[PDB]
Design a protein around this ligand. Sequence first.
Ligand SMILES: NCc1ccc(C(F)(F)F)cc1
Ligand SMILES: NCc1ccc(C(F)(F)F)cc1
Length: 330
Amino acid sequence: STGSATTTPIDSLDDAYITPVQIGTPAQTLNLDFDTGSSDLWVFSSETTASEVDGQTIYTPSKSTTAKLLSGATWSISYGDGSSSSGDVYTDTVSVGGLTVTGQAVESAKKVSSSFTEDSTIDGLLGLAFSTLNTVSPTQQKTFFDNAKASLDSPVFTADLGYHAPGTYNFGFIDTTAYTGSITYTAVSTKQGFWEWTSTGYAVGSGTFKSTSIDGIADTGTTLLYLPATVVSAYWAQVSGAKSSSSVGGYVFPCSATLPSFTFGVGSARIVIPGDYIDFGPISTGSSSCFGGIQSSAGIGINIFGDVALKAAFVVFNGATTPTLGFASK
Ligand SMILES: NCc1ccc(C(F)(F)F)cc1
Ligand SMILES: NCc1ccc(C(F)(F)F)cc1
């Protein structure tokens, strides 16, 4: 079987992408943030503290004839940005773009951090990292992808994120009309539970490509591109007036500047991020200082190929017994 669903940016900056997901019987449709950096499927629900819900669509397990409470199971997650949520666990039927999994663990939020409450357009997250990171206790639960794997035509999913435009998540098949040229595959390490791989280097604008190994994770759930301080300094040095701002929390640049492109290596292939993808607009309404889309990973501890990088490519998440990542231009 296969599944295919359109994913849509939540705002004019592509801060995140939401994809409709059908949960329960009859279907309750929620718009979830597909996150290859985490492994919990959790949703705003009728159990969420009422003051912490502000416009989100909620899952109501009592209205689903297929929902079953998972006795004694709880979950609690903390994301790298400081966000968190926690609650209890149901199993229910979950469908993505025609692809149905029965008995999927659906984690019902009882408490969420302020960043989720203020994001009225995100009804929850759908984790797509490896199931070793799932936070359900005492019995760890499997991801939607892991549950669907056996029935998929091919054990893969692909991310085709749009720049200021809709895109597509496909499960079980590779759309050969969605990319140009060839797909270049690269080795994945699962030892930390992430889609972790090694980029072969980088270039800034039309500059010389620097061959250097950059270990990082492919994370649809993170907005920006987080790279080592040396790389990020070399990029912003080509932008007149750009500087690192402690008060703002990263590199900013005069909004009137034109940004250079950024190239990253995938084996012998090259993915080019257009400079416009790196502009994240004024730091505050009316400001002439703009926030950069490439930032240092030094405080994070791991490099993150987030949406800024992934939306420049067609990305194959190959969940074969030896998993690999594929990148193609588009
Ligand atoms: N998108 C989920 C996520 C959040 C944080 C991290 C970090 F920062 F710990 F690497 C990775 C993945
Ligand atoms: N990386 C996972 C993640 C995704 C979205 C959010 C936000 F923006 F909704 F708070 C936080 C963390």
